[PDB]
Amino acid sequence: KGEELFTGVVPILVELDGDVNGHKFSVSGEGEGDATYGKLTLKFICTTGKLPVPWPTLVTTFVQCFSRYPDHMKRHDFFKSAMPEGYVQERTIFFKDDGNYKTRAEVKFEGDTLVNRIELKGIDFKEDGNILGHKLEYNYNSHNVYIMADKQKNGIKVNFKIRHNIEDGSVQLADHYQQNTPIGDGPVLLPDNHYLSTQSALSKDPNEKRDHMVLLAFVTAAGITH
Amino acid sequence: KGEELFTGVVPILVELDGDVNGHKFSVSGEGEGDATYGKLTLKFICTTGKLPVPWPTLVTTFVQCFSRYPDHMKRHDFFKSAMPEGYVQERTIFFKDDGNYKTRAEVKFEGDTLVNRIELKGIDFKEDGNILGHKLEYNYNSHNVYIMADKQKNGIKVNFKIRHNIEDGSVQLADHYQQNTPIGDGPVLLPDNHYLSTQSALSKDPNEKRDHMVLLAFVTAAGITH
Amino acid sequence: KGEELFTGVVPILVELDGDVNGHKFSVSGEGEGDATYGKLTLKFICTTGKLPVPWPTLVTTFVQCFSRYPDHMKRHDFFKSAMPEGYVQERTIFFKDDGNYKTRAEVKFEGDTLVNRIELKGIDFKEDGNILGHKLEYNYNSHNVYIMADKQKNGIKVNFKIRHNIEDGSVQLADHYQQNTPIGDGPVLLPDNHYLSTQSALSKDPNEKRDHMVLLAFVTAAGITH
Amino acid sequence: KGEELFTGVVPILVELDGDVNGHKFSVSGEGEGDATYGKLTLKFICTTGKLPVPWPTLVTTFVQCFSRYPDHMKRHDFFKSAMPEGYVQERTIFFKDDGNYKTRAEVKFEGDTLVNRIELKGIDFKEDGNILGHKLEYNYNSHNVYIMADKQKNGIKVNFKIRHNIEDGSVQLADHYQQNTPIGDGPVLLPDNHYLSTQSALSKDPNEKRDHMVLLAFVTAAGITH
């Protein structure tokens, strides 16, 4: 009965407080999602000045409730089943041969808006590595995100490896370990194993002078025909 | 050979001259595509006044060389192999229980830009139908586009059905019959049967008073692992 | 309606009368299929002596109603909707750089059994080619079979290319052009574009002295999530 | 350099010692695999008399080195990279609302034959549940098996949920937790996340009087196009 909150266009609000190797920063984001098409549009502004890490590294952190679950897979959509109350999304993101991000987020409805409020901590980054050295290109690849139930936590476990292209033609992996648990006590759907196929386009606003990211995503669940 | 021209961001120009049931109209489009990511961005303006048909019905008419062909399918990308000389793309589009569009286009490079120049004729539309009655929603679904070689023409045949959501909650089908033939006479890649998986985002430029459409697309080839 | 006849194990009979370059031959087959699992098992015997062509070249000729259509695609299964009256299945099979087979078959129920009765004519084969020179390996690859409705015939058009491994390490293509038309005149399901994914195991019955083939197949429809 | 041991047909030997709730049993199996097609054929004999659990429940226990990894995914085939030395395959299989199986197997080459030597322990089964009550049907569904690297163990972690149809029309889940670790010290490929699509056909030998299972499987890896 959470799926019905997502049949139309839903306003999104995103706020993040972060710290990577002692570099403090905040980001605010806003846009809208239309989960019927698995589509979302968001714009992010670093409100504390220059972002200390590359924008691409925060795409996964900045609302999987907006994925398109096709009609035959609707019994497997944990994300929307947890709403309006929401879910807590936690991750550890291991940058290959560099630091890690640990994030904790609350994804829930605040009135009619879907809010994603995040805290992020980055530790052990090389000062001249690809992340703090700003060596990633401003683009993004398409991935598969593997979901499985975690029946003991009443939530789900999620694993995927992001590929960030590097300015020299190599690739920086970011291994994502994730867990989602309901905030409410209402019943949730615990899905069968499946995956999400993702696509992301990064761009800029020609008239925006603050450091910023314009993001459009398409995400569609697949994997189950039983 | 031709695929070398698409390894970076390529400027695009679209030009269409149309006539639907005698209603004449012209649209110009511009933007860019990055085939490495199967992505493109374009803004279309109706330069003659209001569009007499819904914008969504012209998305497929308005550069399948911008699809992403994964490296294991590179031998199957007819579209870029015809470049720079280009190809002619012709369609009959049958709107179920209504009229049809017939289109002929030349897609080729003119300098450094990839231009799509089109002529379109629509006949037999119902004045009270979904098309001239403007009853299509401003949204777009994801499709599978089926491609097969047409050896005798040294080109390809392509077939697919677009699903246009109507404001009354029904879907209007648009059955596409398409053929592509190279403009040049040199060798082109003729593919084994496969498909392209498409996603399209339609939106509006908030600063624009003319009738127009902003489109972002993602398209990736699939269906071949040999 | 027709799909009700395939919820359990259905006996199958196959009968083919062939003529390739004047070499006449007949084959009979029998076994069973379980469409719930998209599976079938058949044993074929050449009742006239040795087969004048390789067994693998006749696998596609020798009951696509035994495919598994997942429940979200049940509206798209033309094959079972034509049952019990059946359909006529016709092909032209073009062996690249060699001859062609033309086939006409009636697939329908005769009592409780689903029988596939075929006539095949092969012309223009090279005496030293891979087919009459028996140079095909006794193995079979997995394919994607593309299906589209052919509204005017109230049937379907199907296209695919089979890859036959040759003993010298090369692959021999067999381009299939196929059309299916219902034998009865009542309504049938006409599908949206989709495909079937096929797998075939060929083997020998260790106790059998006649020329023969044991075949097990798995086939499942895909490509539609709407 | 382990992939080369699987280019042709490879003899398989399977031996299992088990005990489920104090019911001791042994099974021997033999056949052959052709990983180029992702294909295997095996026959099992309960050599201690009547099998105490349903044959379908042991299919997953009775050589993922026989999966077909298509050419573009060959850097992700952990199973063949570990050969000739092999890997240890461990699982816990939780039957929903019933007992669990814990298995440990050695999969390695013994001369030219690929051997799978297993020990299985079943605990906590209901004496009249679906397993010890012999309530499962003799058939099998197709599944996706999700693979991820376990870089700390130099092996892989595997999760999937088998669906066993029950004689009353319901389904018995069997949740599979699996881990594979190399037996040798040679280097192995640690794959990116991906999955295997499986298909299995169970049958009987008309002339065999011992309790037995005849099994044919097709398995193909998918999921990676980078």
mmCIF file of N, CA and C in Angstrom, chain A residues 144 146 148 151 159-160 163 175 177 193-195 223 226, chain D residues 144 146 148 151 159-160 163 175 177 193-195 223 226:
data_model
loop_
_atom_site.group_PDB
_atom_site.id
_atom_site.type_symbol
_atom_site.label_atom_id
_atom_site.label_comp_id
_atom_site.label_asym_id
_atom_site.label_seq_id
_atom_site.Cartn_x
_atom_site.Cartn_y
_atom_site.Cartn_z
ATOM 1 N N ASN A 144 24.482 -2.955 -12.797
ATOM 2 C CA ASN A 144 23.416 -3.788 -12.264
ATOM 3 C C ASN A 144 23.622 -3.802 -10.730
ATOM 4 N N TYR A 146 22.503 -5.712 -7.362
ATOM 5 C CA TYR A 146 21.988 -6.989 -6.932
ATOM 6 C C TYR A 146 21.387 -6.909 -5.543
ATOM 7 N N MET A 148 19.129 -8.711 -2.338
ATOM 8 C CA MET A 148 18.662 -9.970 -1.727
ATOM 9 C C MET A 148 17.999 -9.683 -0.380
ATOM 10 N N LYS A 151 16.230 -11.455 5.792
ATOM 11 C CA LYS A 151 15.057 -11.777 6.580
ATOM 12 C C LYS A 151 15.270 -11.559 8.065
ATOM 13 N N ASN A 159 24.427 -5.284 -3.228
ATOM 14 C CA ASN A 159 25.857 -5.263 -3.599
ATOM 15 C C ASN A 159 25.980 -4.885 -5.094
ATOM 16 N N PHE A 160 26.968 -4.076 -5.404
ATOM 17 C CA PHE A 160 27.219 -3.647 -6.782
ATOM 18 C C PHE A 160 28.566 -2.924 -6.735
ATOM 19 N N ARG A 163 31.763 1.667 -11.632
ATOM 20 C CA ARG A 163 32.936 1.937 -12.453
ATOM 21 C C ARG A 163 33.071 3.414 -12.785
ATOM 22 N N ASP A 175 33.426 -0.308 -4.684
ATOM 23 C CA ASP A 175 32.597 -1.485 -4.299
ATOM 24 C C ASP A 175 31.569 -1.081 -3.274
ATOM 25 N N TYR A 177 28.748 -1.780 -0.468
ATOM 26 C CA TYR A 177 28.084 -2.786 0.397
ATOM 27 C C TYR A 177 26.879 -2.077 0.986
ATOM 28 N N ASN A 193 15.698 -12.696 -4.843
ATOM 29 C CA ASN A 193 16.867 -12.111 -5.447
ATOM 30 C C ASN A 193 16.527 -11.511 -6.818
ATOM 31 N N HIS A 194 17.082 -10.348 -7.103
ATOM 32 C CA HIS A 194 16.771 -9.700 -8.402
ATOM 33 C C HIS A 194 17.801 -8.588 -8.507
ATOM 34 N N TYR A 195 17.748 -7.821 -9.611
ATOM 35 C CA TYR A 195 18.669 -6.728 -9.751
ATOM 36 C C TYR A 195 18.027 -5.485 -10.385
ATOM 37 N N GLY A 223 15.025 -9.615 -13.697
ATOM 38 C CA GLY A 223 15.497 -10.792 -12.963
ATOM 39 C C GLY A 223 14.493 -11.789 -12.491
ATOM 40 N N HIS A 226 9.094 -15.503 -12.321
ATOM 41 C CA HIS A 226 8.231 -16.427 -11.607
ATOM 42 C C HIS A 226 7.220 -15.601 -10.804
ATOM 43 N N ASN D 144 18.027 -18.034 -11.391
ATOM 44 C CA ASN D 144 19.216 -17.223 -11.592
ATOM 45 C C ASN D 144 20.064 -17.398 -10.309
ATOM 46 N N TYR D 146 23.195 -15.848 -8.299
ATOM 47 C CA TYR D 146 23.921 -14.608 -8.164
ATOM 48 C C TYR D 146 25.280 -14.823 -7.528
ATOM 49 N N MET D 148 29.159 -13.312 -6.397
ATOM 50 C CA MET D 148 29.967 -12.114 -6.098
ATOM 51 C C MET D 148 31.335 -12.527 -5.558
ATOM 52 N N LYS D 151 36.784 -11.413 -1.893
ATOM 53 C CA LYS D 151 38.200 -11.135 -2.032
ATOM 54 C C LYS D 151 38.999 -11.534 -0.808
ATOM 55 N N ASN D 159 24.425 -16.840 -4.000
ATOM 56 C CA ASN D 159 23.101 -16.879 -3.345
ATOM 57 C C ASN D 159 22.014 -17.085 -4.427
ATOM 58 N N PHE D 160 21.030 -17.895 -4.108
ATOM 59 C CA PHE D 160 19.921 -18.170 -5.024
ATOM 60 C C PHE D 160 18.902 -18.952 -4.193
ATOM 61 N N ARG D 163 13.085 -23.075 -6.302
ATOM 62 C CA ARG D 163 11.651 -23.298 -6.180
ATOM 63 C C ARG D 163 11.267 -24.730 -6.512
ATOM 64 N N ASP D 175 16.456 -22.000 0.211
ATOM 65 C CA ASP D 175 17.386 -20.841 0.095
ATOM 66 C C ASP D 175 18.814 -21.317 0.142
ATOM 67 N N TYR D 177 22.811 -20.828 0.478
ATOM 68 C CA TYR D 177 23.922 -19.902 0.808
ATOM 69 C C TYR D 177 25.187 -20.622 0.378
ATOM 70 N N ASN D 193 30.288 -8.914 -10.047
ATOM 71 C CA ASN D 193 28.985 -9.476 -9.803
ATOM 72 C C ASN D 193 28.320 -9.896 -11.120
ATOM 73 N N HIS D 194 27.663 -11.041 -11.106
ATOM 74 C CA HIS D 194 27.020 -11.518 -12.357
ATOM 75 C C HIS D 194 26.125 -12.654 -11.893
ATOM 76 N N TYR D 195 25.409 -13.284 -12.842
ATOM 77 C CA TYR D 195 24.575 -14.393 -12.472
ATOM 78 C C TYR D 195 24.591 -15.524 -13.511
ATOM 79 N N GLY D 223 24.875 -10.907 -17.468
ATOM 80 C CA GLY D 223 25.049 -9.846 -16.473
ATOM 81 C C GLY D 223 26.160 -8.868 -16.659
ATOM 82 N N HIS D 226 30.513 -4.967 -19.627
ATOM 83 C CA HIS D 226 31.672 -4.095 -19.549
ATOM 84 C C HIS D 226 32.924 -4.965 -19.706
#
